[PDB]
Amino acid sequence: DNLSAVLYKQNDLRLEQRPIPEPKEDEVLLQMAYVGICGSDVHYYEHGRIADFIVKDPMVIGHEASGTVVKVGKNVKHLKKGDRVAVEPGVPCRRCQFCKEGKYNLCPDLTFCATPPDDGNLARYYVHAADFCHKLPDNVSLEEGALLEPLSVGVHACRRAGVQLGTTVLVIGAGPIGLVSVLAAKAYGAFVVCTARSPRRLEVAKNCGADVTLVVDPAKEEESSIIERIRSAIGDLPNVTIDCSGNEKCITIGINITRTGGTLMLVGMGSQMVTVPLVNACAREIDIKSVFRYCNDYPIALEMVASGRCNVKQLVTHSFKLEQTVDAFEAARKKADNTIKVMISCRQ
Amino acid sequence: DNLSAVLYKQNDLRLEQRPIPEPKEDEVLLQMAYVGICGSDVHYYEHGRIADFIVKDPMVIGHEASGTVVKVGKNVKHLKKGDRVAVEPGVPCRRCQFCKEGKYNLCPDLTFCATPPDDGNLARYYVHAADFCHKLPDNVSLEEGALLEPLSVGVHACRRAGVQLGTTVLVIGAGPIGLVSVLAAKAYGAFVVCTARSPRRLEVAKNCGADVTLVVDPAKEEESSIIERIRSAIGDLPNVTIDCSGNEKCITIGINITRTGGTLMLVGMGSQMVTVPLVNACAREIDIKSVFRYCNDYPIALEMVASGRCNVKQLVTHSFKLEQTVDAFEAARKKADNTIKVMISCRQ
Amino acid sequence: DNLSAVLYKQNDLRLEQRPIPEPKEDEVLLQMAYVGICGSDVHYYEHGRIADFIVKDPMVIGHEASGTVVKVGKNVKHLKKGDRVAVEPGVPCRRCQFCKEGKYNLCPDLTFCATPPDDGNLARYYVHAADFCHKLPDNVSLEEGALLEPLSVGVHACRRAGVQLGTTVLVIGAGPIGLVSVLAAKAYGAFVVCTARSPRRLEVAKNCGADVTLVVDPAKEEESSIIERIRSAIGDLPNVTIDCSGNEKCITIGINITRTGGTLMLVGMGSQMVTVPLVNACAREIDIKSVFRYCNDYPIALEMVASGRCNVKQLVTHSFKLEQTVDAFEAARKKADNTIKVMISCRQ
Amino acid sequence: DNLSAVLYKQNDLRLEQRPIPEPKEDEVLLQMAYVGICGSDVHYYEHGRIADFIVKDPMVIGHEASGTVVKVGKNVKHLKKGDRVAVEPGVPCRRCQFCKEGKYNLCPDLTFCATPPDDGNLARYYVHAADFCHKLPDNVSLEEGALLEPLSVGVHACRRAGVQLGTTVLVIGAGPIGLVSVLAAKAYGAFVVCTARSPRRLEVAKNCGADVTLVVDPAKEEESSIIERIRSAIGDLPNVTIDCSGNEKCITIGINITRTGGTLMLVGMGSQMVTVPLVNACAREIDIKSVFRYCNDYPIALEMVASGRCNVKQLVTHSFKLEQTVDAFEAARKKADNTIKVMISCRQ
Ligand SMILES: [Zn+2]
Ligand SMILES: [Zn+2]
Ligand SMILES: [Zn+2]
Ligand SMILES: [Zn+2]
Ligand SMILES: [Zn+2]
Ligand SMILES: [Zn+2]
Ligand SMILES: [Zn+2]
Ligand SMILES: [Zn+2]
């Protein structure tokens, strides 16, 4: 009654039983409900490593989740049995200078679900620090709670860039990260332009609230005309550009289309190296800021969904049961135009 | 009695008379004293253009200056005849959103001395907006005032990075910009490490107050060992790195040696494109910020020199009279190990 | 054809002709349309002085206005004849450290319309610096443009307090300033609670979007129960309280009800001295910040009205023609429960 | 061998044995060395309560301390036996929104040494969370480490006000808090003016680095002339005023002498209520900010002492052994002109 998706090494993902975990003083036991998957899980799956972070031993996969509190540790007072929660996957050490200064996402001893060597939550049951489980209101479904993990990445990128009323935001890309950036940016009051290769997801981008959408593929069109097309579609240049592609041509465009004194947020995760025109950035004081997951963003993401400002449910294109996890990853690995977010439900 | 250094086109710099300018209501007439020169002047000189900013018509050269107030326009009340001033070369429009928001260095109608089409001040006489002429105290010489222009670039880079007590700063390069960054960073209370190719200027860097200096040449040594050498020379990684080289290997190092959550300030001015590991920056939220000249930095630079925190005079390696301007530029163009800052004196 | 409302001294407000002004190089000539009035105008009217700022000589009254461009000075390029604009009344010197740093509302040589000795715009014609006249879009009426002056005070208070998604704001008072704070705070994504004496304006506060309203009169109810009533009406304590009353009992409440680490924005303008519990503020690091008019807030106010986020037109309770100015001031002086904002139209 | 100073109730402070504490997994056992005392300890002593924080049961007194690591809990890796440390007395819950956001000094479940109901460290032995014990360098004595607690209050006040090069700081009062503010402000590069009643401590203020000192007693001289005396002693008005007195006349002065757009930091801890001219603050956007202890300030305080920027040892006017604690408190209670900081040494 605790089937779990265990990754043994590249391409060896096995669905097998695991003992049911027991909650420490400060933790809660969760009966998982939904678990979304992203490129990061897929990458661990194909190559058995997503960086210098290598899967040396079998590791439960999964980090975008929600579930119901079944049991709580002694000192847990804010959550009780039956509470529905979204799981913020990164639990920091709470004692280094990064945690004391409010930057726990940069904690060096951070334990992040499904980042070797720490087990994820694509299982029937999971134990997690209580302070990182956000109680959900009656009008927010468990599925929506699972989507708070990627929406928080968008919230984090908006907050680091200072997105607000009067900001014009250009989101490059319309895959899931680009779409949550549209949602977060619109929720923050920005005017948003969304650029992408697929006319189909630009359609979702529009339903997400993008004010202007443009079919753009820098592999086909020159950068110069892509830029003018974008400049002509709006007033001034965007003062915040969010690159969700990691692609150097897109980053070069981001740098060249961003308004003087504005910012380019890197959320994509490039190849390894990119050849870019940093000189152009300096000449107009464009700042280039990285976004790494989230920090105290979950509560805002939850408020965006709870108040009705962000429909994140429309992001789920495919749904699979835990037994079909491998099929789920395949659907995620293929990345078809009709594929946005792949979701795995866990209740038996 | 108004000899001026006029640049007609690439390599055609002529020393000739110009009429003596007349001060408008808000300006003052200056009898120039000292004018420093930098790579930017040299570049205009060799190629007749320093970007898309091309010298289409003859232009007086020079932008790092000081001088004495000779005459003042009607509405000028804070400066009077005989006052010694440092000239902040960029005068903004004072009416766009960048100027109203306190970012006048980004004003689109900024007129910067010796940036085509605006005339510089390497002449005997020069007229300039009074509010951009900073009165000097008795203990700050006119020569020191001329050096406030490049010191302000260092102040600007420190302030944009938030350099302060507890900050560890790594300055890559020991040419003039690297040296003012050392001076500004030490004046802000930072612990500074300075890296460069020439053992001779690292010697000046040390006299500037650098706490640690290292001979480093990424054209010879691998990045990996350069990094360890730097990591071993100090405690934690520098949380602020100031690249003064524009070189991609140095920027790659900057990105890889900077502490998580820290910042890489771009002050160098690269070639055109650089191949860099932006992905590595994102994985640790390193921000990359550009520094473009200065903004409300002059008064701080002046206070650093006036209070004795920064000896900028030691930066002048060569001194020439206005008549020897071409020789001055040649000394600047050659860039010998013994050459730091070349200064031209203007009083007859 | 240039009737103007001239204040000669306390209680001596005369409607008389003035010559039609002529636009300097950087100004535009406006055919006024609407002019709102506030307590500040009324106070000048009753006492002939609103501080140490005393009306020594006759002064045209009025500072919350809009109008149509009739003629433009030589160098004016962004505005042309026929353009509809909102008039930002404070024009700074553009050359002191406050203006260079982006704090022009604190400029010491600020000239503010209807603040002795500077003439206001309650006249048929008025000349004003072009960069302080904000062009209006087709869907924003001239009347709405006149209301951008008080809405900007609310925007300024929200921005100085950092109001945003997740902020809970308590606005004390439901007179005009309290109402624009509700509008601005809701436009910024905050959850808003509004407290006031009059059940009738709390009704407007609700239509303005306040999430919770409470009849509160500290002259009748003890502070302790007022607080609990407020605490019980919402979740956590408001992290931003905006006092729009200047009253010491209300400020004391603000200090005691504000969440630890939160902020109390002073926008009211007290009597002279107030007896308050600053000690209580310190014990929980409550910051107390003043709001003085606005700074680069107009464009945001305009965007709030243009995009439909703020209905400011519902604020006008009374409308009078220029000929009935004295009646307008009387309606403003009386301050009846049905009186919010009194507006004077200027077109003949 | 574990004598401890136990406060039973107002005026009943007994020196008696306590069992030697045992270190949990994350704590260390300290053999105390020095413990400074302040008004807060004295107040608990005289009235048996320092607010709504009342001493209901016997409580070990003391919170400004240092000592040597004798034993360490299992998971403690950064500190080892024999290490000399300064004890940061407030240990937060590490799980609320204040701790996650980097504001742990505002944690609601903060346990602060000698704040009922939590025991202090004026004893021979004491156990404390390891991450809140800052290792001292060879050139920083244990006595200096005990003084890092009040110096951190000064660091905290400077950082919250943004004290830096170019800041002019006015410190009102020259008791211990005023003196550490002088030290911290000078260490941050500010120009400092210090005002106080006693000519003798102004002498220490000067040795602390104050640039200007003035004998001022608002109980004798009118506010108006106190202000002019201060204005005439420096250039512009101080942009940061640090009130260390809590006295309403001093706060009124602070508000009236502070530069427009500047800040008044409240560090004193007033009576209960103060009658102040908040209206004057609003008219010039003076912000009033509270300082509550410290947050991530200890490392900076330590660096100020370790690098030689702050001589805090000169602050100790009286030294007593643990056996003479009552005499120590009496010396602190009397507050003579020759009394600054009273220190109690603990090693047998
Ligand atoms: Zn993911
Ligand atoms: Zn940590
Ligand atoms: Zn230069
Ligand atoms: Zn401008
Ligand atoms: Zn008004
Ligand atoms: Zn000004
Ligand atoms: Zn104390
Ligand atoms: Zn806490």
Topology:
The structure is a homotetramer of 348-residue chains.
Chain A: E1 3-9, E2 12-17, E3 27-37, H1 39-47, E4 59-60, E5 64-72, E6 84-87, E7 90-91, H2 97-100, E8 111-112, E9 125-129, E10 133-135, H3 142-146, H4 148-161, E11 168-172, H5 176-187, E12 191-196, H6 199-207, E13 212-215, H7 223-233, E14 240-243, H8 248-257, E15 263-266, E16 274-276, H9 278-282, E17 287-290, H10 298-306, E18 316-321, H11 325-334, E19 341-345
The structure holds zinc ion (ZN) (8 copies).
Cofactor (chains A, B, C, D): Zn(2+)
Pfam family, one (chains A, B, C, D): ADH_zinc_N
GO molecular function (chains A, B, C, D): L-iditol 2-dehydrogenase (NAD+) activity; zinc ion binding
In short:
The first copy, chain A, has 2 domains: 154-291, Rossmann fold (3-Layer(aba) Sandwich); 1-150 and 294-348, Medium-chain alcohol dehydrogenases, catalytic domain (Quinone Oxidoreductase, Chain A, domain 1, Alpha-Beta Complex), CATH 3.90.180.10. Chain A is built from 11 helices and 19 strands.
Q: Give the overall shape of chain A.
A: globular
Strand content of chain A: 25-35%
Characterize the largest beta sheet of chain A: strand count, sense, and whether it forms a barrel: 7 strands, mixed
The CATH C-level name of the largest domain in chain A is Alpha Beta
CATH architecture of the largest domain in chain A: Alpha-Beta Complex
Largest interface: A-B, 36 and 36 residues
Please give the oligomerization state of what you see: homotetramer
| Total of helices of chain A | 11
**What is the fold-level CATH name, i.e. the topology of the largest domain in chain A?**
Quinone Oxidoreductase, Chain A, domain 1
Order of helices and strands of chain A: EEEHEEEEHEEEHHEHEHEHEHEEHEHEHE
Which hetero compounds are present in the coordinates? zinc ion
Got a strand count of chain A? Answer: 19
Q: Which class do the helix and strand fractions of chain A yield?
A: alpha/beta
Our Rg estimate of chain A from Cα atoms comes to: 20 Å
The residue fraction in helices of chain A comes out at 25-40%
InterPro entries (chains A, B, C, D): ADH-like_C (IPR013149), ADH-like_N (IPR013154), ADH_Zn_CS (IPR002328), ER (IPR020843), GroES-like_sf (IPR011032), NAD(P)-bd_dom_sf (IPR036291), SDH-like (IPR045306)
Binding site for Zn(2+) 1 (chains A, B, C, D): 38, 63-64, 149
GO molecular function (chains A, B, C, D): L-iditol 2-dehydrogenase (NAD+) activity; zinc ion binding
Family (chains A, B, C, D): Belongs to the zinc-containing alcohol dehydrogenase family.
